[PDB]
Amino acid sequence: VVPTFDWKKVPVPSTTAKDIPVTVKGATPAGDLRATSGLGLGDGIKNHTDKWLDGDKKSPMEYINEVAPIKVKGLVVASYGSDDPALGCPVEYINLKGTSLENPAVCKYTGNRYYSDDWKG
Amino acid sequence: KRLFGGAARHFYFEICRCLPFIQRLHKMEEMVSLKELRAIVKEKFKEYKDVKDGRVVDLLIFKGREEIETYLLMHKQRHHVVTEVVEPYYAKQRAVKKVTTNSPFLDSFLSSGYAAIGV
Amino acid sequence: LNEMPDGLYKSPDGKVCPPSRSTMKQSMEALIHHFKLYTEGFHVPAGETYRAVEAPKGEFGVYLVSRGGNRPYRCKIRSPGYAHLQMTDVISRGAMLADVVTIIGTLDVVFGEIDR
Amino acid sequence: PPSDHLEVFVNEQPVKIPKGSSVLQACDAAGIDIPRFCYHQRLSIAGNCRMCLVEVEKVPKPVASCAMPAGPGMKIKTETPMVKKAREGVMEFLLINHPLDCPICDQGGECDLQDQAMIFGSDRSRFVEAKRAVEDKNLGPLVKTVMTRCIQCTRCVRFASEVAGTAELGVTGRGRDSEIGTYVEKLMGSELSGNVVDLCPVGALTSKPYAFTARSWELKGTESIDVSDGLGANIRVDARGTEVMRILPRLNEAVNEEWLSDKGRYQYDGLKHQRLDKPMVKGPKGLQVATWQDALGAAAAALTSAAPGEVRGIAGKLADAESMVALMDLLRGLGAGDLAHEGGFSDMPADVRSTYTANTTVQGLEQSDLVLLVGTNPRWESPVFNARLRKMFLDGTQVGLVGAPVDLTYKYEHVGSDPAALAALAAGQHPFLERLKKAARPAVVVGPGVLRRADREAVMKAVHELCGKAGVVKEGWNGFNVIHDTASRVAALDMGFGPSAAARARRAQGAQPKVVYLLGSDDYSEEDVPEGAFVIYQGHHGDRGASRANVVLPGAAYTEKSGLYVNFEGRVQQTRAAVPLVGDAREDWAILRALSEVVGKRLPYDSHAAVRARLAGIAPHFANIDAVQTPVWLNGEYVKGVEALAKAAPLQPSAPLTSTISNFYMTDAISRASRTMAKCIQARQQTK
Amino acid sequence: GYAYARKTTDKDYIASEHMQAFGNTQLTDYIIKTVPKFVKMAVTGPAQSSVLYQEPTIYTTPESLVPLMVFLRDHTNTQFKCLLDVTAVDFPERAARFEVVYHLLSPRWNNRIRVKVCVDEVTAVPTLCKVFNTANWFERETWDMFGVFFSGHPDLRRILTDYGFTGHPLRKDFPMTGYQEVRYDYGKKRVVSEPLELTQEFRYFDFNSPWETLNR
Amino acid sequence: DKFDYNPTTIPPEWHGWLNYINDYNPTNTQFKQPTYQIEASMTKTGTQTCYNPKGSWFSAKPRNWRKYESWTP
Ligand code: SF4
Ligand code: SF4
Numbered sequence A: 001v002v003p004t005f006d007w008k009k010v011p012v013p014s015t016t017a018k019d020i021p022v023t024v025k026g027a028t029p030a031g032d033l034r035a036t037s038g039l040g041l042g043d044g045i046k047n048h049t050d051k052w053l054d055g056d057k058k059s060p061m062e063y064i065n066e067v068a069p070i071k072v073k074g075l076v077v078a079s080y081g082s083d084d085p086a087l088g089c090p091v092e093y094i095n096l097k098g099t100s101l102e103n104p105a106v107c108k109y110t111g112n113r114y115y116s117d118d119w120k121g
Numbered sequence B: 001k002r003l004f005g006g007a008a009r010h011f012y013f014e015i016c017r018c019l020p021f022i023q024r025l026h027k028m029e030e031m032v033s034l035k036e037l038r039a040i041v042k043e044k045f046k047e048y049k050d051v052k053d054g055r056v057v058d059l060l061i062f063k064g065r066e067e068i069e070t071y072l073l074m075h076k077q078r079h080h081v082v083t084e085v086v087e088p089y090y091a092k093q094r095a096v097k098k099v100t101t102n103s104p105f106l107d108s109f110l111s112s113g114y115a116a117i118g119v
Numbered sequence C: 001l002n003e004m005p006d007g008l009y010k011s012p013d014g015k016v017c018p019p020s021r022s023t024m025k026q027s028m029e030a031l032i033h034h035f036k037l038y039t040e041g042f043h044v045p046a047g048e049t050y051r052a053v054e055a056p057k058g059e060f061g062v063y064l065v066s067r068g069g070n071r072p073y074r075c076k077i078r079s080p081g082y083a084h085l086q087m088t089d090v091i092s093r094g095a096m097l098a099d100v101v102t103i104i105g106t107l108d109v110v111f112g113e114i115d116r
Numbered sequence D: 001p002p003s004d005h006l007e008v009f010v011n012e013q014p015v016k017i018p019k020g021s022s023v024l025q026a027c028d029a030a031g032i033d034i035p036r037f038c039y040h041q042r043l044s045i046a047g048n049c050r051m052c053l054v055e056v057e058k059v060p061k062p063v064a065s066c067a068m069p070a071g072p073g074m075k076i077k078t079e080t081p082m083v084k085k086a087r088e089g090v091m092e093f094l095l096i097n098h099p100l101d102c103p104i105c106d107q108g109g110e111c112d113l114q115d116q117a118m119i120f121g122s123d124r125s126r127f128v129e130a131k132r133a134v135e136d137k138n139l140g141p142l143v144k145t146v147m148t149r150c151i152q153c154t155r156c157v158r159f160a161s162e163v164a165g166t167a168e169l170g171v172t173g174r175g176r177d178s179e180i181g182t183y184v185e186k187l188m189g190s191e192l193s194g195n196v197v198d199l200c201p202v203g204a205l206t207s208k209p210y211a212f213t214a215r216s217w218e219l220k221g222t223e224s225i226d227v228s229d230g231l232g233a234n235i236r237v238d239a240r241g242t243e244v245m246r247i248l249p250r251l252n253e254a255v256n257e258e259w260l261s262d263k264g265r266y267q268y269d270g271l272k273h274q275r276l277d278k279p280m281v282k283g284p285k286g287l288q289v290a291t292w293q294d295a296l297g298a299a300a301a302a303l304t305s306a307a308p309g310e311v312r313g314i315a316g317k318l319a320d321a322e323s324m325v326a327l328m329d330l331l332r333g334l335g336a337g338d339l340a341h342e343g344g345f346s347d348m349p350a351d352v353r354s355t356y357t358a359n360t361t362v363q364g365l366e367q368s369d370l371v372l373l374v375g376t377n378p379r380w381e382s383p384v385f386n387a388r389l390r391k392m393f394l395d396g397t398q399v400g401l402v403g404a405p406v407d408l409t410y411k412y413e414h415v416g417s418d419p420a421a422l423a424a425l426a427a428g429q430h431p432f433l434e435r436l437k438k439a440a441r442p443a444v445v446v447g448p449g450v451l452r453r454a455d456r457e458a459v460m461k462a463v464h465e466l467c468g469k470a471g472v473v474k475e476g477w478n479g480f481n482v483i484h485d486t487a488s489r490v491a492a493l494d495m496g497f498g499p500s501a502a503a504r505a506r507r508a509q510g511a512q513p514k515v516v517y518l519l520g521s522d523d524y525s526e527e528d529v530p531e532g533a534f535v536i537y538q539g540h541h542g543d544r545g546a547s548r549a550n551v552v553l554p555g556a557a558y559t560e561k562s563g564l565y566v567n568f569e570g571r572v573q574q575t576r577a578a579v580p581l582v583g584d585a586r587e588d589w590a591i592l593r594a595l596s597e598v599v600g601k602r603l604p605y606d607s608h609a610a611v612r613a614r615l616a617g618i619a620p621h622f623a624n625i626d627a628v629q630t631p632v633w634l635n636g637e638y639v640k641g642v643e644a645l646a647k648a649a650p651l652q653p654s655a656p657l658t659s660t661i662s663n664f665y666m667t668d669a670i671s672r673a674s675r676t677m678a679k680c681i682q683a684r685q686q687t688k
Numbered sequence E: 001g002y003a004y005a006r007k008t009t010d011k012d013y014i015a016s017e018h019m020q021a022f023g024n025t026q027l028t029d030y031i032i033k034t035v036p037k038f039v040k041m042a043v044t045g046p047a048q049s050s051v052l053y054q055e056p057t058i059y060t061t062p063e064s065l066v067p068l069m070v071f072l073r074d075h076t077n078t079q080f081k082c083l084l085d086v087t088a089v090d091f092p093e094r095a096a097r098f099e100v101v102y103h104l105l106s107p108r109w110n111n112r113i114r115v116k117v118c119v120d121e122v123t124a125v126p127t128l129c130k131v132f133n134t135a136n137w138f139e140r141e142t143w144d145m146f147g148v149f150f151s152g153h154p155d156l157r158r159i160l161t162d163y164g165f166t167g168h169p170l171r172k173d174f175p176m177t178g179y180q181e182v183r184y185d186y187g188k189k190r191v192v193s194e195p196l197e198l199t200q201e202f203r204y205f206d207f208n209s210p211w212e213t214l215n216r
Numbered sequence F: 001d002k003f004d005y006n007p008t009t010i011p012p013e014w015h016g017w018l019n020y021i022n023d024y025n026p027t028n029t030q031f032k033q034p035t036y037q038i039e040a041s042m043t044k045t046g047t048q049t050c051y052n053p054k055g056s057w058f059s060a061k062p063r064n065w066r067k068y069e070s071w072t073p
């Protein structure tokens, strides 16, 4: 009674299935759904940065990937994006428990990365 | 005897008196005649032949007056008369019983997805 | 220049006046009020008024009609140069052509406020 | 009645309310809209946000108006100094741990917390301590979590327990460290899982496909209908120019209450891919772009060069009534009669509307105390209808099922699985018949998978005998219901879109057409479109039907046109254009009127109002939009009339009564092109 | 012609106590009692002259606008000599959708008043050209912007809009960008009016909160 | 540049000094130099190497800004 459904035998068109926008690690699990709008579809552009940057110029995402995560003592960190709090972003409180150098926590305003060796680990 | 004091025919007579000076000043002597101009201005009047209110008639006559002095004082030139008065009339009487058997719907279909806005 | 006091230069009602930029980046209520005042704006209560100022060309007045929204329902602008230029028919009578420009210059007219 | 409406006083104004109403409902009946965060009309009362605090005379404390019942002669005050101080204090407590996230939050512009802080709160804060920070949770591809913005209203938990039925969310921890979610990494598996994003009053739960793309103030909203199934849920389409940005439900208590399935909510991204925007004619090189005059001429030439008996017209699942009546009149004007429907049972008799519609209606089904489902899976056919069935289950309506056993998120009694079990139920061998015979208002719901069967007439005769014996249809109550799963089927049955007797005979001896008109059909069978035939495809997506065609005529999608659709209860509803036509596409009935002019026999209507008047001339209930008639019931005279169809094609008592929907997330050309639906399927495949 | 320079010293006062008290408190009742047939409604509100006071608003019929304005100009207690403006406000929900508004200033006693007349699109309002000389251009502008006809005007013609402009732009049902636009044509060698096309259409932002209480 | 002198060749660390905005120049103030800083050069207007939008004819590949994908058979 109530037989299980086999999802693996469900057909998906190959044009649709190969065009899913997904994410690299960053602020999500790697490989989850990436939100997109219609801009760039007529020109065949499936990438975020290519929609406004032209050439082999260094992207902002490649700039922030070169800054290493920062070791912070404690359980919560406050992120302003600047030494002066008037000159940065609104303050962001980022959880640091469960974080390491390999899996750090990222600020949603600045893209800076933080971790703590204080959660008994 | 004539509805609302016969003001439509009095205004029509006033415009018809004003018309040859318009033809001379705007230099429309070889473009249109006074007979066809009188017929065109008559066709402007018939569009509101079913107005049941005298105040709407008075407002329409006042607005038509202000149109006729902005034509008299050269505030609209001959190309304005061409693009607003006589070519809409010639388009409404030129497309009647065309050389093609297409309905108006099929011409609209082949033109665009939506109806035309304005002139 | 001699009686300038120290103190606030803005009204402290945060539901009308936007907060300071340091306050907006550190408190939640200020950021909410900054977000809402810069998108929807404050809602003016329903009513009407006419307010006038001794502008350097005369009386400049605004007739504001409010239904209650974040947008003016009707905003009539009263300009003094509009009334001053209406007088040129009775002021230039009996004058010569070289006095028209003097009359126009002494009425102090600017056509941005005349032609709104 | 012993004064079933009691009188209370709200700000010294007398208000009459029904008995059992709360203080908040009395304030709502007085024209006062009390601020709230945890109360919902469709959920159970919680009473934990403390925002609805009002003052009642002879009570020294503020009462929670959502939970407090209203007594006789009660005096409620909503604008005293203690009420305003209570509102400001509760708002200040709500905002001390909230993150300064309004620029990056998707609720900014349509946030209950923001607007209630602006109106009922203060303008300052006095809090300079460090805030609480929470890690985010993974709940699948449709729900995005930023859990630092949670305000612990527990609307999500109550929704998942009460409406969705899955009951997978909870509150773990205690105190300030209370934390919403699943303890282990799990995926939200409900079909109604996008509704919790609407139910969350803050940006803790937002829509992942929609994320960071638009603000709500930029969107032009259009009230339309949903065509992804046969219920016709009422929706609002939000667009920015030519692009549809999101789809939301809107209230209709007779149809969908406030819900919408995930397919109807998230399939809009398929409208940006594989779109037909130009007419094409197949040449020696293949299909290539042509003018509208050339494409219409080629279609007319193929439609006129063939004999009338070699022409077939197939309607799709999403064709509106105007285009269907246009195609029907155009093909009948040429002397053809071969009409087919992509949704199956094209030869089904459509003589009385009560035999293929839900006579009880959707809202009238709630007055039933016992429900018998025959051969249907309502969770995959219409999840909003199945949610209303669960709502009926929660307040006492018992459910039995004859069919293949399925997960329905409520307990049911499995009477059987085949028409042999249906006959045993009608005879009296199963004790569920005595449960039906003693019920005050029994109901029978027949699904579309029964009507797709080759022996559907014998099964319907057995169902009619069961309804006659169990008192399902009597004086004052009609409990016989047939539901559908396709948007265009009931309108085609209403107008008479069916094949003639000669065409049915020619299909019986195996005649094959040479010209096929595909009105938006992409799930046709291979028996209906022969190889080597001339195919005219009229549609909006490039799919199976357009890759095979010789002439392609681009039409409108349901977000671009205003066409009529009838749901399975008989209610006439309409779409509305939220965006203009794409490219060089046209209106769908207009293509057929132009094609009838190019063929040589014009349709007698030249406007949208005129084709709607033609529809109203065929069946007069088409003119009454947003309403449903009471259909005529002819007792057993109709079943007596079609006994020849029962004698021929006899009963198959061993084939199980199943549901034909095997792919819920991809049912038509729009949902097959949606990348979000493909991610939804991939998420259920990677969990094994 | 009033408020002649009389005191040669600096004055540290505005008005007298008795006349300011009469103007700020009793003027509504006074106007209602002396000329009751002229007044149909009165509002005493937030005071055009200053933020600290209250001032009346008088509603009247078009049949008695001229006698009421003559009374308000020439009566010894209400010497409203200056007419500051004439305008209109459109209320499409009403049977008579227009409110013609007259503001007045009294230099004799430092007062202000507002006078309103409600008419629809086809009811004429009597002109005040003989009472106040500025009423000419303001009535011309009101006819131009709203289509209110002022009977008895010497020359009611449009003053602000374009030469061939039909249509009254300040109505609520008139579009913000209009119907026609203007360009130069090289073939016709003339500046030509054409139907409107926009490279970027206007984006309407609907900001209004569903919790807001003040919307009326 | 004696023959084609232009104020767009003044660097931003001298711009505020020469425009009397501040009293800072490199000879008395150590400015913070970002790693992405583009040096100041003369304007390119009037030539064909000026800035143009992405839908322009002078671009390497002009954009059609359609927000949907067309079906290609
Ligand atoms: S939920 Fe989002 S938009 Fe609302 S107040 Fe919090 S951060 Fe701002
Ligand atoms: S996630 Fe949203 S609905 Fe759930 S408890 Fe938090 S605020 Fe309430």
Ligand code: FES
Pocket (backbone or CB within 6 Å): D035, D036, D037, D038, D039, D046, D047, D048, D049, D050, D051, D052, D064, D065, D066, D067
């Ligand atoms: S709405 Fe009553 S306590 Fe939350």
